[PDB]
Design a protein around this ligand. Sequence first.
Ligand SMILES: Nc1ncnc2c1ncn2[C@@H]1O[C@H](COP(=O)(O)OP(=O)(O)O)[C@@H](O)[C@H]1O
Ligand SMILES: [Mg+2]
Lengths: 127, 54, 465, 114, 469
Amino acid sequence: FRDNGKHALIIYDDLSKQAVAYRQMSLLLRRPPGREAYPGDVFYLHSRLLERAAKMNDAFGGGSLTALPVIETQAGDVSAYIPTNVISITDGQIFLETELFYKGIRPAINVGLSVSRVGSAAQTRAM
Amino acid sequence: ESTTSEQSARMTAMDNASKNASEMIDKLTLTFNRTRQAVITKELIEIISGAAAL
Amino acid sequence: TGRIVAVIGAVVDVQFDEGLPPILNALEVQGRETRLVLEVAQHLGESTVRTIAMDGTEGLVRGQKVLDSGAPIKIPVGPETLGRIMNVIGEPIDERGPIKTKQFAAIHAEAPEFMEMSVEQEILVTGIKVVDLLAPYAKGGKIGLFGGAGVGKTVLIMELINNVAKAHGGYSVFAGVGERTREGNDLYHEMIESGVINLKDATSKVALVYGQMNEPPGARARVALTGLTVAEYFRDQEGQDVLLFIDNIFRFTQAGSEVSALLGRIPSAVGYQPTLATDMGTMQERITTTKKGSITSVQAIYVPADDLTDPAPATTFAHLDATTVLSRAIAELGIYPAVDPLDSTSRIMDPNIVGSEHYDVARGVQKILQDYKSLQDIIAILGMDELSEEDKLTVSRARKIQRFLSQPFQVAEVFTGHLGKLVPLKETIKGFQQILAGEYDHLPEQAFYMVGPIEEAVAKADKLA
Amino acid sequence: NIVGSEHYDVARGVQKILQDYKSLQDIIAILGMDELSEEDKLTVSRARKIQRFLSQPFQVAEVFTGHLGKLVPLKETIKGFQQILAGEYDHLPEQAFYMVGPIEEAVAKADKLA
Amino acid sequence: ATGRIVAVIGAVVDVQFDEGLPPILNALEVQGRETRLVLEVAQHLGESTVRTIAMDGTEGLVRGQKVLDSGAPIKIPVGPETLGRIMNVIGEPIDERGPIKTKQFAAIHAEAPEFMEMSVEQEILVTGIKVVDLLAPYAKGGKIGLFGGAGVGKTVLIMELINNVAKAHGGYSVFAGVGERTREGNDLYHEMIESGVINLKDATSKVALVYGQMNEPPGARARVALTGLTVAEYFRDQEGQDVLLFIDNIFRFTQAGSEVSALLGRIPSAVGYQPTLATDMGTMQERITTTKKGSITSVQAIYVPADDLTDPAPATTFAHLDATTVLSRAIAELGIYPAVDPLDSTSRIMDPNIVGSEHYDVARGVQKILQDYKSLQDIIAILGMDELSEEDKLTVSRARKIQRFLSQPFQVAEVFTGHLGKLVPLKETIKGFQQILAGEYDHLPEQAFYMVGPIEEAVAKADKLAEEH
Ligand SMILES: Nc1ncnc2c1ncn2[C@@H]1O[C@H](COP(=O)(O)OP(=O)(O)O)[C@@H](O)[C@H]1O
Ligand SMILES: [Mg+2]
């Protein structure tokens, strides 16, 4: 759809369980593990996939492709190996707190840590 | 009056010194548990790499 | 036939000539006293397979003879398996004669397809007032049972067997994954003295699968599959609403990471196997609600080193739909069953699943049980009478609610002398809808202790004085 | 020798008042603020403005917050850390020192929250 | 039977024979060197190929040097003539005073005595140190251990027991130094001539010395401790005297075998040691015993790596020691010297049927007031010292005087201190500590007990501080 002038949208759900599936095929080939027994090329796994989601110019049709991956953290750990390899790729974040979901605020969006860099200039002037 | 004013503020100021010491005691429990797993993981790789190169 | 070439520990290598068997088959060693079943796991090339044993390996000579079944491990299945005890290979281990039945089934079987799943959530009712109101049970889901010994856990097992066979008509299977012999003998005789198993006729309600603790590490991992084949017979052939008990799920994970290290594989994170997420996948996806019937599972969960983010209790947690926790601090308060009402959660607790009548009743119960938890500290430290008159009723009502959650069980009729009550769903919602509004507040506390519905509560206030 | 004897002396006073504040964070977090000395309620009350005076609104981040990008000269970031380490500005709150350029806009911000 | 060299990797030399294979644990002489290089056989590999470990360096070795065989393990010279001489691993003298001329040669590899050759009697050997004799008494014919990290005093405390014990002792004495600084083997040869223990002019010396230091190849720091307790086995067995034995250090026996291991073809165990760690340790430590033919007192210094007694090398020597003296850096940084931990040192004869009921209720009376002092420090950190009651302001002030009274000025540490060397007897150590506990010295400040001898000097030092106000 992107190369033929249409707009698409894709939700990967989730990229955490992909990287525990690439870990299994790597260690079953006897490859040297790294941090958290992961292989050395986990960054090649998620960068070569999320680089395709782009917007072509008007001479190429004018379509687009938006991505929205999902990462699951273990007890608020936003300083682990996998949730930092994907923060350093995507153009922003949306944080969901497990201790605002218990207090009755839903959707529990952490407004302090949620940022979107490039998408701020493209919104409605009414909004 | 002054021994009642003092003995009530000893009740409050010893209460916030146990909330702040229990708020601090959960944040070091997660870091203890990340680091406990990371040492079993690290010294497991050294045995495997020592046997594979042999 | 084949021949044994290598014997190293609990790993035997078998050399064939023509009929090379595929993976997940089952061989059988010829010349020995008891059955020794080998399970093929790898094709090593030049007609050689890599097998894991299921019993003792000593006495095996290099160059013996080994047959082939041509199929996986096939167990005796049927309706006449109710009330017997078997190991992982279907043999009976209680010296009551051979089990005789019509058909057999294989334990390594695929999941149901995508077009056979249920498209809607549905609540399973078990009769207990604390379970079916605050942490209800979905039909087909996986349940985690927190708590251990000395809390009253083995009664809650023996009573959920009895109530489903009364209100729903579905039997159960018990699978002991690496369990102690001393504690797997007392559960045999505790079920006899409560009626759910019976040595005289065909009114039994369970089938026991016991793979005990002193068995080789390949034989402690397949027990949760043998005890799931039997549970699939009563859904695929008869269409019942079966239950399934695994005790526990950590000894299924831990017994997996000792086969994957005897087979020469590089370990993952902290010591587990590389395949920690598919062995939990290719077991717990067979526990589902198809179009014929369902299978519901209650599993015991042991957390190692009090780490909730260890990979063994983190893989399991993505499969559960409801958790119930047995607190010992409610067992010293006198309440039975000792289920904590505040620290139990359910995923199907939702206004678009169980409706708005169940929701706003069970929402207010956990809110009022928090206010008594916050006001019990001012009363213990400062004193009683300083708090308002609007708060004295919340102290009085929350001691009515947390005693109305008690319920006498049918499995304990001989000992505590009371009558076992099985409460349907529409009585438990009607009851707590009136305690909150102050409608039955003038009656004393002991009218609510150990009754059935709300009707038997006011019939007990008359007998006082 | 290279940067001078006046640049080198103000830059070492800043690393001294920020290290002594770092050794009191284990006590302020437990026993609170009312357990310190009287001269150590001044190391805390001055290091919490030097920390906020090391903030600056960048020029490329105009599209983040909508604030103007500010640039300072080298001779004026020596004067800003002398009139704080001496005690000239002990009558202003900490949030008046937040996200400004040179030292003259700090007193042009504390008149707003009056 | 000659053989050739086919491979050299590091300190592990492979030697292929042709017709006669020597057994494991032998000696092979490399022909072609100007020095003597001995190879010790360690493994068999098939097709007449052994794998050896080298005692000296391996520079200048070429593939094809013809290697002889001895037919026996490393037989050092032994006898009465080796007293007052320094010798090598293979028995050569390095004191440059001539050849050791004796009649008996003895291999260093031999068995352990059986179960019906053990002795069972226990005694008490008095030293004169106040911390040692009170809370963890040593014993005649018993194995003693000196734990602790790096730079707390293991070499000085083992230099103190040669000062007190070795000159008042009747029989002989042996010092094996394994893997320590080559400087400190010269401050022993020059602190034992000026005290007359080593005599360079006649035949009245009482000390032998065996030295393999930390400049040697790692195949030679693991056969020196077997050479120390071979000379010390001659005196116990072929003669009948009472022998002592001092070993420093003994952690460098385990570490020097964890370096040749991975080239011999072994998978590593936990944190990096060899798989055969607790077997060759227990094969050496079963020859240092008291049999029915003699008695060997033995003091050993044991390095603990980076202050962790859960490391697998120090935490398996505990099964071979009767009296452990755990040193500590948390005491030494107070100024309390010798830094011996009282709540971590044990003995097998702390027993009211052996040391009497009066010594026993004094030892446990000291540890009970020190351990109860530990739990009181957790309150003073939040409350303060003055807000305590008057009843536990006294058990602190009694405990602080017991901490300071244990520190004693040593004799061989005069050049550090300038103070004089004290030696408190056993009957005075108990009577000093009864009176601080009962309260007979509550009128003195804490400084009157620091670095004193008996309790008599604790009040003489108290008045001399008073007059300078
Ligand atoms: N009698 C003593 N009491 C306390 N400390 C001492 C004494 N003698 C030496 N030391 C200290 O012990 C340190 C190391 O001495 P030494 O025993 O030679 O080293 P190590 O114990 O590491 O082999 C020295 O820095 C010295 O200050
Ligand atoms: Mg030393």
